[PDB]
Design a protein that fits this description.
The structure is cut from a larger assembly and holds 1 copy of chain A (about 200 residues), 1 copy of chain B (about 90 residues), 3 copies of chain C, 4 copies of chain D and 1 copy of chain J (about 110 residues). Chain A has about 200 residues and is of the alpha/beta class. In chain A, about 35% of the residues lie in helices and about 25% in strands. Chain J has about 110 residues and is an alpha+beta fold. The chains are: A alpha/beta (about 200), B mainly alpha (about 90), C alpha+beta (about 60), D alpha+beta (about 140), J alpha+beta (about 110). Chain E: It comes from African swine fever virus.
Chain lengths: ~200, ~90, ~60, ~140, ~60, ~350, ~120, ~240, ~45, ~110
Amino acid sequence: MAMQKLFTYIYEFIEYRKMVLLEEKVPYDKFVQMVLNTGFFRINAETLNHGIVSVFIFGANGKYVHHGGDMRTLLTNTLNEKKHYEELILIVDKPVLSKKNILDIIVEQRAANPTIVINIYPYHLFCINIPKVSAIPKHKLITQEEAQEFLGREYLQPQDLMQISASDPPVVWLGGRPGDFVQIERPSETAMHAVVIRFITKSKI
Amino acid sequence: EEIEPEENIKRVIFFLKELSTMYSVSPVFTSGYMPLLYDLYRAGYLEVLWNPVEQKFLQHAEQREKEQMILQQVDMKLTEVITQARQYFKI
Amino acid sequence: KMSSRSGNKGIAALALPTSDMPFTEDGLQPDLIVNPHSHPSRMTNGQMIETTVGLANALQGV
Amino acid sequence: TIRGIPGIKNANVVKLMRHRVDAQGKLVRLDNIYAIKTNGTNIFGAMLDDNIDPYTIVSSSIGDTMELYGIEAARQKIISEIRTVMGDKGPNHRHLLMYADLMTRTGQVTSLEKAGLNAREPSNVLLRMALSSPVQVLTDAAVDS
Amino acid sequence: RYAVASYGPTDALTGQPLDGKRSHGGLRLGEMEHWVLTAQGAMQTIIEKSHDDSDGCISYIC
Amino acid sequence: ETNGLFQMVATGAKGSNPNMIHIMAGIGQIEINTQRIQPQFSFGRTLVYYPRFALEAQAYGFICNSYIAGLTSPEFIFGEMNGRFDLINKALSTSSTGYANRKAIFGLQSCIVDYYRRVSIDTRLVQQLYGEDGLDARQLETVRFETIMLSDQELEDKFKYTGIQSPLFEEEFSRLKKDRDKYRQIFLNVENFNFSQLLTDVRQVPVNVASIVKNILLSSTSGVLPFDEKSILQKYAMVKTFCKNLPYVFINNIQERLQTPIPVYLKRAASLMRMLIRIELATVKTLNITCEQMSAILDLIRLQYTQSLINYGEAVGILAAQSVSEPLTQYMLDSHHRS
Amino acid sequence: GWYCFSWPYRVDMNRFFQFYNEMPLVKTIAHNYVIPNGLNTIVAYMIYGGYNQEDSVIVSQSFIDRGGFAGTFYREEKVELESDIESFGKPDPLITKNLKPGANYEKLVDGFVPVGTVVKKGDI
Amino acid sequence: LENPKISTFQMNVSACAWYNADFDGDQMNLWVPWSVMSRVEAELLCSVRNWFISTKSSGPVNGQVQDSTVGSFLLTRTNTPMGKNVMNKLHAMGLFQTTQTDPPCFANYSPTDLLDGKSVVSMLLRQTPINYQRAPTWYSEVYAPYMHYNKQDISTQIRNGELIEGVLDKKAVGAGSSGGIYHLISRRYGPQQALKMIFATQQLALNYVRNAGFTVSTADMLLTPEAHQEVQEIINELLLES
Amino acid sequence: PSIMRRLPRKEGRIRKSLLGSQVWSISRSTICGNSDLHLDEVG
Amino acid sequence: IVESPSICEGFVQASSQTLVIIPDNERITSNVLTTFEATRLVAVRAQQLAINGSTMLKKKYSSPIDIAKQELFNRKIPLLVMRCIKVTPEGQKIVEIWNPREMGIPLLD
């Protein structure tokens, strides 16, 4: 029942990022029909700075995840359009993450476009409202100035803090990029709660 | 850059000043009152802060110093006697 | 280190003269004094039964 | 797969106790709460079920919690799992944080073995030499300058 | 029982005392004891035992 | 009143209830790895003394006799089967624990508390604050929190002061109430991502604030104080200011005088201490305390709070490894009581 | 116990010969084939001063003096020679080199200490 | 130890909890610091008083073990098989002749005056007054139906050092007992002061037994013939269900 | 015999000569019970 | 082209450092000696007394340890505690200088 969870929590994820939808919503049956016919479903949103985020949801048995050429031509056709792109979210089945060729096209597209963030994610990262999970503490991106003040007070460097990957699910939902700082408020059985600051690093794919 | 303590701490520092010539305590004038707190805790008598019964602890410290001096002098006399006797027996 | 036949080993700790050891009304006094707390956790019941049987054997001469 | 979710071989029913704030603000212990304790772990499998609350899925697997929830939830999972092993005559809580905070300081759950030490402390050769195999570490240190 | 000295037979290679009572050497402050002394913060004790009493020397480095 | 064996067990000096039952009543079922004696003697026989596919419970380790009555040959063999496991697991409780102890220390030993009470590896933070509270394990007191289990009506019955009609005491109860909610919200969430970790109104705090108030009240010659409006208002201001400057215990007295901004992670460290102080120094609980005695309580609270702070340069990584790898000896000793 | 019936004919290392042994008042079938080793000590199961706590025992001094669990303990010294290089004999201070500090060479008789004398620490 | 025949390292039994040691044949190392720097740090940092409270479980390590746990119960017990648990002035003074603390004052007592164990324990706890109120290990609802518990032995209450009622056992004076008597003394008076009271209370427990006695026998383990028939009738029910 | 064989195992250079140590001015003996000694005293 | 090694690289001797003392009002470390620092102070003073023996303590004791303890307690110890805060890549060594004559002693006597 993955696709049903995606159909609701991808829009919950878009809302959580404070992005405005561009294309009007469609029923779930039409969504699965498009996923079956075309092989993928495409959602568009615009950021406060008018940056365009396009999220691709790929079927498990689609041609774009088995043939590398299909993914290559799809990404090439999407990346040369007259829109203010800032990120492409490629939601695929988890085994697709293990396919070396697909990741090869992904990294080649990253190299060809140094100003566009290309990310590939499994289904399970968008099947719950991740911030609402009880086991997950409260993450919050902090500005560069606040982090600089904190490090100056503590005589610390960004490389000295704890580090968290940009592919970390709450970091993905926040929208953190490598080089940013995330403040985490977490429960504690000693001081009843604690606050830490982590330095976001590069994603694992 | 401290300027002046409070009346409670004023009388406590007066107590410590009077106790300095009587116990291994030297009063300082830090703003946080903290070395004073450690000195009072180490002396085994933190009751100055709320109970005005400092005089009995002053007498207690005088007494304890008295037995300390008495025992020290007794030990010195004993050890000099032992030294002289051992010298006698060695000769 | 000394031990019984039930596996309750022990280390000699104190050496008392014949007048400091406890004695019965009939004059019997122990050679070893072992803690009663050695038994309940190790359940060496054969040592206690041996003392009960051996106590009657001495008087009966058997 | 027929009539089930992959990864779990047995699913029992247990009685567990929870607190809940009443309408009068009183915190009361609720003893008549039934749940499912399974043998085998699949967070994503039980995630998709409509009969299970997805927000309060408690796994015993650090790797599975790390995969789906993150490093912060994996940090709380290491603390919980060590405490279960420690029993009740166990150490203070601050000693369990030291294990989890060390093992999760790099964004990934490192181990307390030679591979884990090489990730947290790659440049500490002398400590790495003492742990497992000085010859292998010494040879690699020389070529890497 | 054992108690040896401030000095005695010495290992040729490491400069440390010999092993055990049989060789009239010293006793071992092993790996686990330096862990405890470090945990307690006893660092001047480690200098006294592991350096002054075992093999401590002076190394000259340019 | 005269049984030596029973008094050793009943008073906790030595032994337990299963020891007396085994001695006097019966050993019962021998259970290895939470199961009966499996048949390893030629396809369905547990021993040579019992037939194949035996149905009686005695054939599978049920010892019907007690130690005082003696065991038979088959019962002694089954007892030796379980007794040998104790010897085997005791031997493993040394080597297997030692393998895990050494690996834990070599990974954790580099963690040392620096001058910020952080835990770091020579530059690299492992903890922003040691134990997230900055305290020592040897300096902890187990103290109950009153407000946690109370309903909102009886929270107002016990902690709302109605002697003085001032807006200040409305904020005092509101701060008491939302500290109660914050404790509930956090530790109910902790209950959610655990198997059987229930909420408790009892915490390990460095200072037993209730005892200090009780101690001073006893040693004071003043009995029931008369009603004084300014003294009650002054005490509330003293407590509110003390809780505001409480995080300065982690820095020094120099910054407290200068009132420099406190880091966020240090405000969270003193959250439990702030909560307990406002519970035990509530206006209802300090009616018979003078303003001069209140200064002694505040001075004594931060004296004990500073004494419980972790030392600079303490090898806490070795402390944690020793504290965690030691219970593994008992965990390994009970290897035959687990599946 | 009686570790060997031919102990005086043997030069053994780290062997203890307990003088007195008793057949247990409650014997077993194992004592039909081996000699019992021990004594029937009178044992009191009591708390007496707290010196027998934590698996300790309190021993009568009189029982010790009378020979309870008393015996003789043996050690051996087997020294070999190098053929025609070394020899057995008392050294002399004015010829031999690096004699052991704080030694006692005067107890040697023709290279060996005579039988029956008490040798203490530092004696050659 | 001036006795030339002693070759062992002797220590108090209550000190074994630090080292997880016992006297079945264990051997322990001992080195005396000689350097001034190492001798200073031994007194200030490595003293055993610094680890009365465990750095592992945050609780006390030391207490009464196996003779002052049952000895304290007998001393603080309300009723003796020979009447009320009292003692004359002569035997009350004899309990304090080994504690190595300053003796109390028995001047306000006739030779025929009787003192109970609670009074004797109180004279020692006045030095470090604490507040303690819990249920002793002696009381257990498992034993309750088949026992007649004394109502003054199931509630151990101490206020300002005065043992008002109850018995002292593993719950109050036992080793590793969190919130116990010696845990409260350490928190209020220092870990060194708690160690002296462990020794001091150990002597009263041992001095009480010097003429009260404690033993275990074979008949302490023997069921009556009527109760043996009840045990196997219970076991036969288990074999009937099986 | 080789130079690198001296390093690895428990009886090796690192774990026997560096992480451990043989020391002088130390004593060992069997321990014993003594109820007249304080908890911070050793016979 | 990355060429052969030169003399600019390959230095083994680390460059010298400049001791940067934090001003008294800008200090962050506690105004209370830790047990480690107090023990180190007492041990150092006792060893120096065993070397020199010159002290201004008015009372008389027959052991360097006792004299050092009383000097620390009477706030007459001629030592300072330097708490190394950070070693900066440019060369500075930021430290904290604390006077044990105006800090709280954690020891007991």
